[PDB]
Amino acid sequence: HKSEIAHRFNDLGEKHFKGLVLVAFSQYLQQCPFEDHVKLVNEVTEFAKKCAADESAENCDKSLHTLFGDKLCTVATLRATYGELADCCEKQEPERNECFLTHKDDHPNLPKLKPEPDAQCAAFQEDPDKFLGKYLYEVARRHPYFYGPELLFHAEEYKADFTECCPADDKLACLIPKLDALKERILLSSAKERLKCSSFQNFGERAVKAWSVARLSQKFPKADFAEVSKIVTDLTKVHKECCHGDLLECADDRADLAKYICEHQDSISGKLKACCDKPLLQKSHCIAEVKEDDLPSDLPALAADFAEDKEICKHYKDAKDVFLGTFLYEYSRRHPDYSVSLLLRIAKTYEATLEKCCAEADPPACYRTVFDQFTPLVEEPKSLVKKNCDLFEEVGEYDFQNALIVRYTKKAPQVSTPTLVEIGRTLGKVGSRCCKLPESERLPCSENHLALALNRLCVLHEKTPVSEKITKCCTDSLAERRPCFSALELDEGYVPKEFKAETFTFHADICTLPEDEKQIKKQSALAELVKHKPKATKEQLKTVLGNFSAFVAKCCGREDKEACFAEEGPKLVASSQLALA
Ligand SMILES: O=C(O)c1cc(I)cc(I)c1O
Ligand SMILES: O=C(O)c1cc(I)cc(I)c1O
Ligand SMILES: O=C(O)c1cc(I)cc(I)c1O
Ligand SMILES: O=C(O)c1cc(I)cc(I)c1O
């Protein structure tokens, strides 16, 4: 890295480089229009090229963040558009970058990416590069911690979507479901990555490593610990870089990691073969999403090393991180059936148990039961997975979301309704994602995914702290975030939001809404019902919401939708309150 920009440019190649720089900028400057960003990345890419041509050219030896940060800081109306980021631009690197990062907007609340399949295919044909670029921009700026290389990957998917659908007859129906599925994948990936970044940010790299160790151990149970460690080290670096906005380095290192992993796929997992026969983004993505390898038949019994060995305390004092790390690896690799956070909690408990036991007189007698300390850690979420998947399976996603929305509005009524609705909806999306899964997968799926949504909440909460319960759950141990949240009950301290009839007042407008947004409106109402009536049981809320849904469906099916809403809503608005006592 004589010229780090030349280096990244050469490594990544212009398409990916430009894409990542676009992502980077879009993420750092989420409000600057697409075209601004494009000129920004073109300038940066031109400069990258100039540097690759001659790495001794002036400023070519400046760091990527110096370079890009500078480019960002040159944007038109940086102070009017980003009064916060202005000050960042006053700052040198890495302070500047740290500032930009800090001012990343996790909830830019930009317009909903909705297909305009005619206009968009049009723009995809007019310039597919400007269109996929635009996509990178849109998604990136909506998700300023979106995993850059992954975004490029998704850009590829998105392209494929417009490649397949734009020529198609019902381009809209060929495309929208793809784009919808893609948004779900985006949202999920964004959340995954945001979690990673949040984890660095809020818990540090060790937390991320522990997480990755657990995860990768599950994913690559056959890989030995050194291997998982190496990959976790690298992957953590990749995520660290991506999260710290070092997207070129992140991508480059990710590519390297993918290469490494694929070079060692037999040392790592048989599930990689499909990933490693893919091109670089697709390969990386595939490894990132790779299904867990089969448990090896030679998984070591764990009691000997981790419970029975008489010098465990010695190992544990002598090499805490390595011993624990390997414990985590072992437990995790044998526990794809556990969420990562469960494995971490288990690791934490294993650690806590050595801490306890090893400070005790006969540590071996004490930690010999260590594996048994994990049991309640396992049962708690397994029980929730069952409780909630039962519920989900019983009531379906909407009502599950309602459930969650109620629960979370209860837990954190201070949270904006849109956020509760979002979180509860995403949380219910866990029901959909995880409850249908093979039973051994629901727990990992659901807790991992809840980690994402909770992190989302946390992330949103960072920006918009409204609840201390949220803060605590979000900032106390990450492994416990989900249990912390799950454990949250009705914030008793919450003064019920004053009643605003209007809030629960629907109008014919809701009828034009696609069912998702109709639901969201209802679910917002729902959150509001909770906020106003926090102690309303979830069942009262459900009935009231059912009443609202009923009235909404009715009045929407009405000849005069609005007369209907106007006549029936108020009574409903008033009565539903009595139903929430
Ligand atoms: O328009 C887009 O760029 C777009 C992008 C995604 I990701 C999802 C949907 I639905 C979209 O319409
Ligand atoms: O998710 C990722 O960012 C990721 C990327 C690569 I390359 C390898 C693994 I394992 C991952 O988990
Ligand atoms: O709502 C929960 O607290 C919850 C927790 C877990 I772990 C799994 C599922 I599915 C849930 O719904
Ligand atoms: O379907 C449910 O079980 C459900 C659960 C809760 I908690 C709140 C609402 I509204 C519901 O509709």
UniProtKB/Swiss-Prot annotation:
Q: In which tissues is it expressed?
A: Plasma.
At which positions is Zn(2+) bound? 65, 244, 246
Keyword Oxidoreductase assigned to the entry: answer is no
> Which parts of the sequence carry Phosphothreonine?
81, 417, 419, 543
**Family matches, as SMART domains:** ALBUMIN
UniProt modified residues of type Phosphoserine:
3, 56, 63, 416, 486
Annotated S-S bridges:
51-60, 73-89, 88-99, 121-166, 165-174, 197-243, 242-250, 262-276, 275-286, 313-358, 357-366, 389-435, 434-445, 458-474, 473-484, 511-556, 555-564
InterPro entries with a match to the protein in the record? ALB/AFP/VDB (IPR000264), Serum_albumin-like (IPR020858), Serum_albumin/AFP/Afamin (IPR021177), Serum_albumin_CS (IPR020857), Serum_albumin_N (IPR014760)
Instruction: Name one matching Pfam family.
Output: Serum_albumin
| Residues annotated for Ca(2+) 1 binding in this entry | 4, 241, 246, 249
Per the similarity annotation, which family is this?
A: Belongs to the ALB/AFP/VDB family.
Q: What does this protein do?
A: Binds water, Ca(2+), Na(+), K(+), fatty acids, hormones, bilirubin and drugs. Its main function is the regulation of the colloidal osmotic pressure of blood. Major zinc transporter in plasma, typically binds about 80% of all plasma zinc. Major calcium and magnesium transporter in plasma, binds approximately 45% of circulating calcium and magnesium in plasma. Potentially has more than two calcium-binding sites and might additionally bind calcium in a non-specific manner.
- How is this protein organized at the quaternary level? Interacts with FCGRT; this interaction regulates ALB homeostasis. Interacts with TASOR. In plasma, occurs in a covalently-linked complex with chromophore-bound alpha-1-microglobulin; this interaction does not prevent fatty acid binding to ALB.
Which PANTHER family does this one have?
ALBUMIN (PTHR11385:SF15), SERUM ALBUMIN-RELATED (PTHR11385)
What's the protein here called? Answer: Albumin
Organism annotation: Equus caballus (Horse)
Taxonomy of the source species: Eukaryota, Metazoa, Chordata, Craniata, Vertebrata
What gene makes this protein? ALB
